[PDB]
Design a protein around this ligand. Structure first.
Ligand SMILES: O=Cc1c[nH]c2ccccc12
Ligand SMILES: O=Cc1c[nH]c2ccccc12
Ligand SMILES: [Mg+2]
Ligand SMILES: [Mg+2]
Lengths: 123, 125
């Protein structure tokens, strides 16, 4: 009974947090220090017309026409832990159309790891 | 196997913990409202940016914090949303210390674990 209780409440908590992330009205992605996409919400995928399998594990410069690989390296490297910055990006959708966004980017520590949390909003 | 079960529970726990941290660490403020404008949940960013403890915010109405909307303005705003509708609009939060913060709110009406809720992401402008 204690086991099943713990499991059931853990599911309920997780489910609510998952809905809050996936349904956020803004696009959300998480990067490692290499610019690799570690996580993305469904809002990010839907706005760009990609399946999450076409986004996770890929590099963020593949999606932002305003930044190449070096540009992204330079951007990420300058952040202090807990620093936030806002800047313009230009995402390329799966169909080749584009989306002008303002990205609000945070360097933070996630599960012991150096990560970046990006919230993108259509301009 | 008990050992296999424990590994499954651990994976579920880590996932929940990860999603928790994404919510709390969001660089933008997050609040969840019911259809009456009552604040049901807030992330740490919301509390920190406005200078309030969570206990000073939960259960209050959003018009108590946004200087650009009275109770009637909030009621009218929320009642116009269809389920899954999103809108962006300007607000002006009043911090605990009386300073103000101009924001653009991106607001969503959606079904959250069976409940009629609004999810608001506020960006400092
Ligand atoms: O993380 C999302 C993102 C979109 N454009 C850039 C550019 C540089 C770093 C991160 C990002
Ligand atoms: O939910 C946050 C928020 C801030 N200003 C307003 C105004 C009307 C509805 C919701 C909100
Ligand atoms: Mg995912
Ligand atoms: Mg009015």
């Amino acid at each position: 009974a204690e086991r099943k209780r713990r499991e059931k409440r853990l599911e309920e908590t997780s489910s609510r947090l998952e809905a809050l992330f996936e349904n956020s009205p803004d696009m959300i992605d998480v990067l490692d220090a290499d610019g690799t996409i570690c996580e993305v919400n469904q809002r990010f995928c839907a706005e760009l017309g990609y399946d999450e399998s076409e986004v996770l594990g890929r590099s963020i410069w593949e999606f932002d026409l305003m930044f190449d690989a070096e540009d992204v390296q330079t951007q990420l490297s300058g952040f202090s832990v807990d620093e936030r910055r806002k800047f313009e990006g230009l995402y390329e959708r799966r169909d080749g159309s584009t989306m002008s966004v303002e990205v609000h980017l945070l360097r933070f520590n996630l599960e012991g790891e150096d990560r970046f949390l990006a919230i993108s909003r259509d301009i």
